[PDB]
Design a binder for this molecule. Structure first.
Ligand SMILES: CCCCCCCCCCCCCCCCCC(=O)OC[C@H](COP(=O)([O-])OCC[N+](C)(C)C)OC(=O)CCCCCCCCCCCCCCCCC
Ligand SMILES: CCCCCCCCCCCCCCCCCC(=O)OC[C@H](COP(=O)([O-])OCC[N+](C)(C)C)OC(=O)CCCCCCCCCCCCCCCCC
Ligand SMILES: CCCCCCCCCCCCCCCCCC(=O)OC[C@H](COP(=O)([O-])OCC[N+](C)(C)C)OC(=O)CCCCCCCCCCCCCCCCC
Ligand SMILES: CCCCCCCCCCCCCCCCCC(=O)OC[C@H](COP(=O)(O)OCCN)OC(=O)CCCCCCCCCCCCCCCCC
Ligand SMILES: CCCCCCCCCCCCCCCCCC(=O)OC[C@H](COP(=O)(O)OCCN)OC(=O)CCCCCCCCCCCCCCCCC
Ligand SMILES: CCCCCCCCCCCCCCCCCC(=O)OC[C@H](COP(=O)(O)OCCN)OC(=O)CCCCCCCCCCCCCCCCC
Ligand SMILES: CCCCCCCCCCC1=C(C)C(=O)C(OC)=C(OC)C1=O
Ligand code: SF4
Ligand code: SF4
Ligand code: SF4
Lengths: 176, 156, 104, 43, 318
């Protein structure tokens, strides 16, 4: 249940001593290393052609956040504040009131994406699949406050990415 | 006229040269170092864009702040930024360099490196993937591509 | 003459490259930046002196490809092997008296 | 039930040991080749 | 007409130095299982141009220098010596055909350490000076075996004339009578140009290459292109010295094609050595010189003195 790395006493007969002296004087392991580097010279490189090729992702991927809707246009978030209760960065800020038809909806739904640790606890805490974390990772900004998302940005991300978000949830909801 | 055309083509030449030969200095402070090292790994391979891996910090173009900036390494960050030759850019990688991140309310963390240095590109994630950082590097290249240094020089 | 022309041309191209590389990046007006004995080692000096003395021994060895053409070949071969042997004896005394240590 | 499982016979054998396959000539042979190249050059 | 010949030497030297950076980044890319540059030009062919234009409009870094005069003269001397090492190279005809081209190149390469020494003086940091003195001690250490290997090989040539060294190798490559000299030559020229695994300035084992150190240094492109001129030149010199090609005096282009292909293979061998090994520690390459290469070099020097005498193969002076 254990093995000894580097507990080999070398053979001291003239054959092995001449082997090690030929290794010293004729640089045999150095030519071995040159041969291994030369072997990688003639391989096809592992380089993908970004942006025209994309790295492989799964339907579980945790990228940009989005607020979703039912298949009626009604937004799924019913202001229950589980996602900011579980948010380990406290990146989520929610206010709420009954809207004009008496429905429990949010007035504020902020996610500071620069506090956010992208761990998907909000999408697993959400009882109505409202907040999800979409597949978008190509959303670098040029200013810090463009990453301080309010509810309108998250609803636009939901409307923007729903055709993909719904298919990824369709692929992964039986594991959840 | 003619001079506007000449300074426009010279802007195009120098912007092409500066964006297509970006040399990054990386503050590999924390976990985002691992993902920049994947952005230099053979799949994504920053070096095929002209973006050499392990450039000298003395002659670097962009400072990639990849990790959590603490209060104890904020003056070293600013010192390395002050030793950079212009034109210098700063890519803030990841949530702790952007805005404090998971350690935003800590006693010992600078809430985003933009309290210390001017930031050009904010790359979001914890960590952002190596593909997302390469997206931010290409957005920095596009930002350099639309610079107008000689056109604004000519119009002043 | 052609050698002097070539040396002047190489010196001129080098000075032109240096003058361009110092004055061409001064075209763009930059933001004027306003923010803000060495220890001796005996081994560093000893490797330089060992270089100098073996380089003088090499200066003795450099006329050998002309010295093989002589008619006094036995004397020439004796003194050639003797200079290379004295270089080797200088190296052996540098070895055994701890002279090649920590810059071995 | 449909779960991520190994197949019926299990997976195949996975190598995990060092394979540095001992290529090259012998120590006598490499010095012989070098001395032969020297003697051909000298001749 | 002669100035045309000087310029058609020295301008393609600079163009070859430009595209050696591309060849380095590509060949080191594919050996590292990735690609080199392929975006900036078609197959990366605009990468040296873009990189040179970037380096020539970049600000002088932060600091000031201890001595203005040596801060100016070190890149001037580095580029001047890097360009004058090419003028006696017989390819098949040297630009300056001199009787002592070998000794000229040995002397002008011995003069090249003053650029390193004066750039160490011209920096303000007392640690960059220590790094420069380590580099100077390395280069002057391997110049010893350069001189003695070069002498031992020229004992089969008959003279210091570089053009005679084509005539010497008309029957066989000179690597066949002198392959231990050839391999210690190749590794010693590798250790001359501060090239990996001997690059201690550009790597670790260094007291000053340590991230947010001082030391105003020169414009990097000039020392860099002097260094790559030296790399291509020492590989062409090794090609002339040990792997000399067939020369038809009515068709010089055959020799030029042949030595060019061999020099490209030998420069790619430099690229392939730097992408294969870790670095020496400083005392380990001092060990490799003083305790390993120099005893074999003195022994083979005695051998190559006494060997044309015992074989009756003393080469002619003319
Ligand atoms: C041959 C080998 C390769 C050599 C290099 C490649 C060839 C091109 C050389 C010229 C490059 C372009 C001009 C220098 C770079 C200018 C960049 C810049 O920021 O300019 C702003 C500067 C200054 O612009 P500014 O007045 O707005 O200053 C900005 C900085 N503040 C506000 C803080 C002071 O422009 C100039 O000084 C103009 C220089 C001449 C314009 C070109 C004329 C022809 C040149 C040939
Ligand atoms: C230690 C001694 C090393 C040298 C041994 C003799 C080498 C040799 O061939 O000498 C002949 C050579 C030359 O003899 P030669 O036989 O070639 O002379 C023929 C005449 N010429 C030179 C014009 C062609 O030297 C001498 O004969 C005299 C000089 C050396 C005398 C001995 C010195 C001893 C030093 C001890 C301290
Ligand atoms: C010109 C074209 C290219 C030429 C060939 C070069 C291409 C190959 C390059 C490979 C990569 C090398 C990268 C750098 C490597 C540096 C490290 C290294 O190799 O160190 C050298 C090593 C150093 O030794 P070491 O460190 O490996 O071993 C330990 C050393 N001690 C014990 C001191 C601690 O070996 C040498 O110095 C060998 C030098 C050349 C040997 C020439 C052998 C001549 C044999 C003659 C016959 C001998 C038989 C007995 C006598 C018979 C008489 C009839
Ligand atoms: C009076 C008229 C003249 C006025 C003054 C101008 C003088 C001439 C200056 C050069 C030409 C000016 C224009 C420069 C390029 C502008 C266009 C451009 O940038 O096109 C982009 C295109 C690549 O597209 P990209 O945005 O990189 O996309 C990523 C890949 N999908 O880019 C490309 O396809 C490649 C662009 C190459 C740029 C030109 C080639 C390099 C410059 C050579 C000359 C200068 C240097 C000489 C040698 C110096 C030492 C080596
Ligand atoms: C000894 C041999 C030495 C060899 C040295 C050179 C090696 C590389 C050789 C060149 C390889 C191909 C280069 C192609 C560069 C890109 C050309 C091009 O079309 O760039 C596109 C860019 C923008 O074009 P745009 O009008 O926007 O097009 C939109 C289309 N609807 O258009 C532009 O930017 C404008 C056109 C720029 C063209 C630049 C071409 C390369 C110039 C390199 C300088 C050296 C030239 C050779 C000198 C030595 C030989 C004589
Ligand atoms: C910091 C200062 C600036 C630094 C940068 C610039 C200086 C450093 C780089 C330049 C070094 C110059 C070296 C030139 C001489 C080399 C030796 C030499 O002349 O060898 C060539 C040749 C010998 O061969 P051979 O065939 O025997 O003679 C011709 C007879 N058939 O002999 C000939 O062909 C003889 C030709 C006539 C004599 C030529 C004399 C040249 C001018 C005087 C020396 C100039 C350099 C002074 C400064 C050196 C560095 C400080
Ligand atoms: C006149 C032509 C000038 C071309 C300049 C190219 C400079 C080399 C670019 C890449 C590079 C390499 C290969 C390199 O080896 C190196 O040293 C470690 C760099 O500095 C950090 C580099 O940036
Ligand atoms: S992914 Fe995690 S850190 Fe980000 S908003 Fe959701 S719960 Fe908060
Ligand atoms: S957990 Fe879901 S429904 Fe509840 S407040 Fe958050 S997003 Fe809205
Ligand atoms: S933003 Fe997150 S993953 Fe990235 S370095 Fe910071 S703690 Fe690590």
């Amino acid at each position: 249940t254990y093995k000894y790395v580097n507990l080999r006493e070398p053979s001291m007969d003239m054959k092995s001593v001449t082997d090690r002296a030929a290794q010293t004087l004729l640089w045999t392991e150095l030519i071995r290393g040159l041969g291994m580097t030369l072997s990688y010279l003639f391989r096809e490189p592992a380089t993908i052609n970004y942006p025209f090729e994309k790295g492989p992702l799964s339907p579980r991927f945790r990228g940009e956040h989005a607020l979703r809707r039912y298949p009626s246009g009604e937004e799924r978030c019913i202001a229950c504040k589980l996602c900011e209760a579980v948010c380990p960065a406290q990146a989520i800020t929610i206010e709420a009131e009954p809207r004009a038809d008496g429905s429990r909806r949010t007035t504020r739904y902020d996610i500071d994406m620069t506090k956010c640790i992208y761990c998907g606890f909000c999408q697993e805490a959400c009882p109505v699949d409202a907040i999800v974390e979409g597949p978008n990772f190509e959303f670098s900004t040029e200013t810090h406050e463009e990453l301080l998302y309010n509810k309108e940005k998250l609803l636009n991300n939901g409307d923007k990415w729903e055709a993909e978000i719904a298919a990824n949830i369709q692929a992964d909801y039986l594991y959840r | 006229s003619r001079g506007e055309y000449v300074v426009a083509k010279l802007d195009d030449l120098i912007n092409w040269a500066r964006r297509s030969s970006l040399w990054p200095m990386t503050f590999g402070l924390a976990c985002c170092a691992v993902e920049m090292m994947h952005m230099a790994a053979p799949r994504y391979d920053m070096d095929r864009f002209g973006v050499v891996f392990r450039a000298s910090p003395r002659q670097s173009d962009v400072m990639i702040v990849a990790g959590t900036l603490t209060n104890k390494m904020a003056p070293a960050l600013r010192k390395v930024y002050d030793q950079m030759p212009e034109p210098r850019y700063v890519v803030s990688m990841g949530s702790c360099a952007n805005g404090g991140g998971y350690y935003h309310y800590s006693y010992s963390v600078v809430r985003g490196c933009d309290r210390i240095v001017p930031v050009d590109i904010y790359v979001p994630g914890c960590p952002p993937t190596a593909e997302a950082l390469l997206y931010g590097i290409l957005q920095l290249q596009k930002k350099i591509k639309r610079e107008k240094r000689l056109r604004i020089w000519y119009r002043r | 003459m052609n050698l002097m022309i070539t040396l002047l041309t190489n010196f001129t191209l080098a000075t032109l490259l240096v003058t361009i590389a110092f004055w061409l990046p001064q075209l763009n007006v930059y933001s004027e930046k306003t923010s803000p004995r060495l220890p001796f080692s005996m081994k560093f000096f000893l490797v330089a002196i060992t270089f100098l003395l073996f380089d003088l021994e090499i200066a003795l060895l450099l006329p050998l490809p002309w010295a093989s053409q002589t008619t006094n070949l036995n004397t020439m071969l004796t003194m050639a092997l003797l200079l290379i042997f004295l270089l080797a004896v200088s190296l052996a005394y540098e070895w055994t008296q701890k002279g090649l240590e920590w810059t071995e | 039930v449909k779960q991520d499982m190994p197949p019926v016979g299990g997976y195949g054998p996975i190598d995990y040991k060092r394979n540095l396959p001992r290529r090259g000539l012998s120590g006598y042979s490499m010095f012989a080749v070098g001395i032969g190249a020297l003697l051909f050059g000298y001749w | 007409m002669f100035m045309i010949n000087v310029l058609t030497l020295i301008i393609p030297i600079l163009l070859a130095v430009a595209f050696l950076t591309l060849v380095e980044r590509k060949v080191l890319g594919y050996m590292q299982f990735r690609k080199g540059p392929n975006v900036v030009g078609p197959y990366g062919l605009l990468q040296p141009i873009a990189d040179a234009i970037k380096l020539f409009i970049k600000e002088p870094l932060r600091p000031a220098t201890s001595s203005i005069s040596m801060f100016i003269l070190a890149p001037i001397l580095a580029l001047t010596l890097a360009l004058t090492m090419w003028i006696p190279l017989p390819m098949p005809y040297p630009l300056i055909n001199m009787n002592l081209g070998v000794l000229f190149m040995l002397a002008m390469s011995s003069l090249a350490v003053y650029s390193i020494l004066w750039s160490g003086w011209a920096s303000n940091s007392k640690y960059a000076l220590i790094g420069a003195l380590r580099a100077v001690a390395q280069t002057i250490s391997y110049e010893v075996t350069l001189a003695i290997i070069l002498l031992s090989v020229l004992l089969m040539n008959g003279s210091f004339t570089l053009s005679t060294l084509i005539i010497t190798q008309e029957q066989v490559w000179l690597i066949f009578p002198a392959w231990p000299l050839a391999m210690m030559w190749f590794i010693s020229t590798l250790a001359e140009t501060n090239r990996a695994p001997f690059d201690l300035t550009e790597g670790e084992s260094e007291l000053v290459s340590g991230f947010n150190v001082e030391y105003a240094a020169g414009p990097f492109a000039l020392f860099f292109m002097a260094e790559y001129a030296n790399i291509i030149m020492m590989n062409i010199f090794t090609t002339t010295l040990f792997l000399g090609a067939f020369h038809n005096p009515y068709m010089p282009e055959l020799y030029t094609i042949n030595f060019t292909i061999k020099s490209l293979l030998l420069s790619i061998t430099f690229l392939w050595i730097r992408a294969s090994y870790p670095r020496f520690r400083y005392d380990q390459l001092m060990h490799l010189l003083w305790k390993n290469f120099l005893p074999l070099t003195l022994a083979l020097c005695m051998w190559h003195v006494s060997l044309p005498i015992l074989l009756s193969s003393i080469p002619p002076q003319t």
